[PDB]
Design an enzyme around this catalytic site. Sequence first.
Site, mmCIF file in Angstrom:
data_model
loop_
_atom_site.group_PDB
_atom_site.id
_atom_site.type_symbol
_atom_site.label_atom_id
_atom_site.label_comp_id
_atom_site.label_asym_id
_atom_site.label_seq_id
_atom_site.Cartn_x
_atom_site.Cartn_y
_atom_site.Cartn_z
ATOM 1 N N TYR A 100 63.056 24.595 53.211
ATOM 2 C CA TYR A 100 63.070 25.279 51.525
ATOM 3 C C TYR A 100 64.147 25.868 51.337
ATOM 4 C CZ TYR A 100 57.925 24.253 50.959
ATOM 5 O OH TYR A 100 56.446 23.513 50.817
ATOM 6 N N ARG B 20 59.048 17.980 44.302
ATOM 7 C CA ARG B 20 58.613 16.985 45.387
ATOM 8 C C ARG B 20 57.586 16.316 45.131
ATOM 9 N NH1 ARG B 20 56.216 20.742 50.484
ATOM 10 N NH2 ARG B 20 55.556 18.854 51.841
ATOM 11 N N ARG C 278 63.311 17.268 57.920
ATOM 12 C CA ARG C 278 63.658 18.269 57.020
ATOM 13 C C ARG C 278 65.419 18.558 57.599
ATOM 14 N NH1 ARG C 278 58.450 21.827 55.091
ATOM 15 N NH2 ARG C 278 57.872 20.243 53.625
ATOM 16 N N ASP D 120 51.386 27.790 57.557
ATOM 17 C CA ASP D 120 51.151 28.137 56.260
ATOM 18 C C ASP D 120 49.680 28.911 56.447
ATOM 19 O OD1 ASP D 120 53.027 26.601 55.259
ATOM 20 O OD2 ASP D 120 51.817 24.816 54.803
ATOM 21 N N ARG E 66 59.543 32.544 55.943
ATOM 22 C CA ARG E 66 59.768 31.050 55.308
ATOM 23 C C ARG E 66 59.797 31.334 53.834
ATOM 24 N NH1 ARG E 66 56.301 25.775 56.180
ATOM 25 N NH2 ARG E 66 57.975 25.553 54.386
ATOM 26 N N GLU F 22 55.777 20.873 44.289
ATOM 27 C CA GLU F 22 56.414 22.064 43.894
ATOM 28 C C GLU F 22 57.616 21.591 43.105
ATOM 29 O OE1 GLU F 22 56.923 22.078 48.068
ATOM 30 O OE2 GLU F 22 55.661 24.075 48.402
#
Length: 659
Positions: free
Chosen positions: A613, A518, A580, A233, A208, A502
């Site tokens: 991302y 963001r 997303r 994460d 990622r 971010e």
Amino acid sequence: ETPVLEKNNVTLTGGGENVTKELKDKFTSGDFTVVIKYNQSSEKGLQALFGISNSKPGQQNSYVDVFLRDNGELGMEARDTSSNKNNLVSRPASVWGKYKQEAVTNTVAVVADSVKKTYSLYANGTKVVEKKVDNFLNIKDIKGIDYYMLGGVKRAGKTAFGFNGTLENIKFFNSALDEETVKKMTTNAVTGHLIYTANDTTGSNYFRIPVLYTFSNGRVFSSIDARYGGTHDFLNKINIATSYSDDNGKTWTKPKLTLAFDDFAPVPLEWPREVGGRDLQISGGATYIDSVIVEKKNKQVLMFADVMPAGVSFREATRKDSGYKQIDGNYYLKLRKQGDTDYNYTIRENGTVYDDRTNRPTEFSVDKNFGIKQNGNYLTVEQYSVSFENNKKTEYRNGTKVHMNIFYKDALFKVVPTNYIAYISSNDHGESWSAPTLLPPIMGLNRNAPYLGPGRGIIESSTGRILIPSYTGKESAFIYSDDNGASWKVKVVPLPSSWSAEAQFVELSPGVIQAYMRTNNGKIAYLTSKDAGTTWSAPEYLKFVSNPSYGTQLSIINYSQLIDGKKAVILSTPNSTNGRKHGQIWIGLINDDNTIDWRYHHDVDYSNYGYSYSTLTELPNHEIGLMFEKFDSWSRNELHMKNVVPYITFKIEDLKKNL
């Protein structure tokens, strides 16, 4: 070895083609493999590449097929009406739709293996799923199969799931071909867009958070999270891997581990994707996560990353302790020895560990890579491995002895369990790197370090100030040096709500900087500084992006060449309230008054395809490089997927669309 049927260049518009005469009763064992090179003229609706069915009234739940959805999902069905067995195997984000206005050629495959009771699916070189099912069906297990077609499924005398596109080559085999063969067969031009791949030289199955940067010598540099225990994460094990290109992004070095701990081995792990298991995590390996890159005026390259001790997660981390003490005006990282309640020790000059109660050196020291010594000899611990044999996760000590380290759960001296920021430097444009340097507690002694905004830093042109974007959960934190990176300060800006802010920077004109970021309100925010990052305006918001409240990371860069007589910026972000997805690259022209005219955009693939991302860089020839998460990395349905972070290039003419 050789197909029972091969066909070439069959163009279809939803009607299918009957091949019953050319397949009838040819699947003697009942196993099968079908390899399909195709492109779609339209992505809408559930579309079958082939269908093998009982076409008679009342037998519409007796078929085998492989299908495509409008979101890139590839799946297969195997169903028998009378036994009421209904098998469905699939993975999201398996294929590509369109690329620069044109249909992408994919190659997919299905393998049904009776001895293993598995269905396997392949897309562009990747085995995207292999699933054992109790109610397994082969072609002979489905009763009264009588219709074999291309581009649909014959159900009760009507064609279902009509394919729109061209089957460039389709091969049917009456046996289960082996994995290496089918990977080979499905490998094509799409495969070449992956820089990082499952079980390459990083040992990770998952990735990622890609980052791209072009150095002043023409080298194109990438970094990324190698996430070993699925794409979580936390809790996880994560390293930062790197790879570079010296030919404008045409070829890339074998990935290297650049920031990596070794308390856990970097190994390929089969993370489960079912509703139960997908939430499983490892106990936690020490971690580096979320990289930021910048090249200094002197051509030295800096990479920053977040550092997490083993077992500690962003949400559980203490926010009331920096992990530092101040002793005689200096900031020393503090340590707790096993069995103590308080943090009685600090790492001082030369890595010598001092007892702060007696203010004297101990026999212990810590090297610049965080490894612990006693009397000049390294202490060791045993490394962990993780295995997943069937359904059961096990963590075990694996026989390897590694240096004991202050970030590990088995250390005799341990850091405060919170987050930190580290950086490394390179003097050879990324071929080799220094040991890491932990940032000092610039947020205060009684606050945790900020979290980095993945992407790049910048050098502001008029002052030479280096800027590194970060955030705390309630504030923006713009990290900066005015002394060419010798020391570091921070500008902290409170925010209207609790954004995961971010951020990335662009320079509009000398001394004038915008931070795009963001939010938690569905919009992309931008704040403006007219004094090179010293003071910041209230937020403004882009009018044309509308996303979910959780938001996504973005990429924005300055572009070096004039577009329509104007300086330009280039923005990449998902744009969709449903997830997303619907990735877009936008071109902003800087007006005379430093507002931006967002004049053009290009959709990256179809709008229901995943896009999370992302990272942009200007290539040496003034083309644009993009690397992005071609999936929804928030969705609980798209966790733990292999080979989903592609690299692609665009000419400006490819982007100058939708005036």
